[PDB]
Amino acid sequence: NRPPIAIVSPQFQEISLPTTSTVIDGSQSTDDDKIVQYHWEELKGPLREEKISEDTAILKLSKLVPGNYTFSLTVVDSDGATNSTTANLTVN
Amino acid sequence: NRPPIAIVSPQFQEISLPTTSTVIDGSQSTDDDKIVQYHWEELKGPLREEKISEDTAILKLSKLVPGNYTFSLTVVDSDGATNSTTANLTVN
């Protein structure tokens, strides 16, 4: 009964706007059984009129303001074991 | 969902010993579904070294002392509805 292995890639990224739109793949989630869901939550971000809550494997970002970002991918398997790995995104 | 109909026969009986052994049929238990169990309990009897507790459809009695007896047949169906009818046995 191995717990899932959550591998978010790329881990570190440097992006300078008029191309704020950035995607970090989260589909590289190793487990014996099916990954029932993916959960994305941004722990830290500069104040923005919106807050990042999604369930997609490939997270889509748009309208990124300058600052430092730290996103957290939480995966759950069939049994229920959860492994959370954090991703750091930086915009110039 | 009709409740079971418990019909104990014979209802009334007069027996004088050296033939104490008497059987009162309880298998005449009308219901739509199977009668899951029969329960026999004697409400009143002259003090005896034994007490009548059984689950058989045809109650077997032996070693009956003089006095008045009142037996109670309780039937339960598949659903759980219970109908209890009492039987009166008298020995001379």
Add this chain to the structure above:
Amino acid sequence: DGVGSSSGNWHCDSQWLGDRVITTSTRTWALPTYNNHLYKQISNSTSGGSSNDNAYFGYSTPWGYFDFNRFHCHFSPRDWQRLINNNWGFRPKRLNFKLFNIQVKEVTDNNGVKTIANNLTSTVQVFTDSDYQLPYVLGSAHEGCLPPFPADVFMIPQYGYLTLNDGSQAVGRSSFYCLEYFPSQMLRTGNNFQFSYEFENVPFHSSYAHSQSLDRLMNPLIDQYLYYLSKTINGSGQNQQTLKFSVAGPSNMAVQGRNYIPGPSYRQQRVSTTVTQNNNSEFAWPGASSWALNGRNSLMNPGPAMASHKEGEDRFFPLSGSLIFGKQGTGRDNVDADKVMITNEEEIKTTNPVATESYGQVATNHQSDGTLAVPFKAQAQTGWVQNQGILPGMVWQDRDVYLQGPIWAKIPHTDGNFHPSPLMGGFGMKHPPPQILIKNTPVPADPPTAFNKDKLNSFITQYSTGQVSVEIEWELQKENSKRWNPEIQYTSNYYKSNNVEFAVNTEGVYSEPRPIGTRYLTRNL
């Protein structure tokens, strides 16, 4: 028959009768005992886990299967030159698979000393899945096929199929085919095996590039008596709508009326070989075409036959839309761009839309300038067509087959399909040549004196050797074009170089430098 008598002679010639090319081939095979003669099941649960997309559930059968569905198993590069240079198509016609000259050898390991002495009695089983009642696994270019260079002795790949899998757990429909449940044939060092197979009527492959662009099919000297709408406003101003037609001639060939339109399109991401131009982000997986049935994604590799790049953009190539063969001596994974050779498809840019381009545009609203009681002044806006399905009268050309490319692939037994030409290239056959699964029988070492009901897991290690010969007669369609400009042909450059192309290196490793297409001659639309 008998130990001291060869059971079949080594045929490797390649006859050229004329309109028939019998291409015999023979290589020496060595077959170990896989999985210790067991049927261990495989899942990502056992292989250490995987993503949601990569989950699988299948069985690791101990049989080895001879695979020869790659063009360079049969065609020596000189024959492939003689077949692409002057021929307009070919198709297999028959097969002949002689498995002869088996010798089974017993390996003994005492004090780490390897002593190999042959068993004149042990038997090796062979049988052909002649009703396709097994999961067909020939037809993904699985790297186990016959050695490009004849001398090369190869190891027979293991046979293991996949079935349904809800995650890594099987379902009720998950089938388990036990190979021994098939009537085998037992060869014991003096016997030979042979089945003849007749290829079904598979259409001639297109060994020619079109010398007439599908959008330049007309006559450049005569108008076309079909007027096209040319102007819509007389001149710059307020309230000056008009409707002026004009004839569509040679001066304006874009708006010319046309009978046929280019084939399907499923847009691929564009990646440029000059690494500087690609964007500075990891778009390998996120941002590539995928079809994703049953909720699990999968790259649209290589997808529908589409031209790799527009004329003059050589450096580009679609992300997941071209076969990319690895040159000899290349690493299994994370190799640089120069150690893998990419098959570009500029050869069918005529009758196929460019893989990285967006197949025209379709208008999305009505250009009703002034409407009655609901005024919007909406201009005619156009939207692109990233993916376009097959319409009435659409022509296209199927993908090319390369020397290092597959031949056949079983058409899945489904209630319907359209143009079953395997997207990797080759021929689509409802009844392809069968698998030939070979297993050397277990021989238990020394069972106990006392009875024991277990599976007798102690077998003596052994393997096999022999030769395998695949004679597969092709049928040609000779070319009779009245072209006057000299045709374009495939040649090997005359220039001094350390090694001859398609010839062995100083160490003996046979190196194929480039993939060879089969579309060199030219045939007008």
Add this chain to the structure above:
Amino acid sequence: DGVGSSSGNWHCDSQWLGDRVITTSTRTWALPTYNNHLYKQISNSTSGGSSNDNAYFGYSTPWGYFDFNRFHCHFSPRDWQRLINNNWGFRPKRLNFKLFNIQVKEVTDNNGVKTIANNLTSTVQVFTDSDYQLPYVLGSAHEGCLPPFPADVFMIPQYGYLTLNDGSQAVGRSSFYCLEYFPSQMLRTGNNFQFSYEFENVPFHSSYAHSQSLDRLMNPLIDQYLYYLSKTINGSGQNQQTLKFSVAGPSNMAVQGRNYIPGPSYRQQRVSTTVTQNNNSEFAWPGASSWALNGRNSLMNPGPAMASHKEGEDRFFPLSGSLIFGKQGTGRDNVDADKVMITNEEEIKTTNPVATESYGQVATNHQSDGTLAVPFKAQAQTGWVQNQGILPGMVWQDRDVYLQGPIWAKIPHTDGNFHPSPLMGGFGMKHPPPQILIKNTPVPADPPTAFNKDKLNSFITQYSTGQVSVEIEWELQKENSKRWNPEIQYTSNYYKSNNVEFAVNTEGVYSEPRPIGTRYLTRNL
């Protein structure tokens, strides 16, 4: 014939001609040299003693015998599904036993190093007891039969019979059959053995459960013009005897007159799988049905075909009245309840009395209330019938055969018997398929230079290997029931699980999860 030529090809297919099911099978056999080529006698006196019941006296012959009287030797579970799902019975029709591809191997032990080199000269004897003049030992489900999974290589079980025994000492009638005293056949690594056997006229097995309870065989809409005694006293009181009859209709189906009565009964002890309900005492041996001829007890296992439990009491099962097969990987003795799978028989509760129930009741005295000069006032007392012999017009159904269950069993050569259907299930044949006893001949190592008259006890250790193939054509009786409610069939549950049922585990061990009966279709009485 010859070392370098296989003496027979591996047939394992299972043809389905229609009304005939030829089920070939082949497995690899390894046969050691049992008992060092001697005929040591066995008794409990040598095996360390035993109870009075377990005493035996028999000989341990060094021959190994091929046993294939289990249904899963031939029928792959898919074939067994195709044979129980839609068929109303089957019976073997022929046999064909090819023993081919022998190879004899010599084992040398020097300094504890095992070097195995084959003897191209040593011979292995085979012969079939084709007149049953040997003690038949096939027919107790002795665990040595052919491997459920074809690949599985098995060890041939040893042949040893039992004779009469007064305690552990033989008597005058105790027979001693010397196997070599039979005309053998010697195979020496290039020969093959084959006998064809014709099955006698054995009745069709009952592959169907009855869809009409034997006590509900009547018409529920019409009375029966046979009056039954209903009342005997008018009402509660003194001296009120009477005799009132009434018609036996549908309102009271218990007293309905019936042509036929359920089959025999030999009451078994009741044990419940929910371990809490069983009594807290060791009633394994004391309190189980036994027949005990010649003064030694023996469990009535499994006894006369009797239904395991009354409708709705699934947890129960008779103590010694059901075949209880062990799942793969189970211990030899003292295994828990979950590691052994129990064959319940609810499928013939229609026409057989429940195994744990007491087959009705029989009156034991006369209900003569007032007698002349000998007054007793004896009420009609009834006693139960724990065991009931076969009466006039009694019908019953023989026991089921499971996939892991025996096929045949020799009917003992006795002056009489009744319904010889082996109680474990299967077919009763006066002339079953013969034993095939195989022994590899002794080859003395190196006798002295000087003469010596002893038995030359120094032989060189060796064993054998090959294949064995048993083609046994069955005959089917197709079903043509006009039932409208969909039949009940055998299926494998569609639900994700770690392993496919009847498929190999990650390690390669073939696991059969449940016993498969053969009574699924329904046929009215």
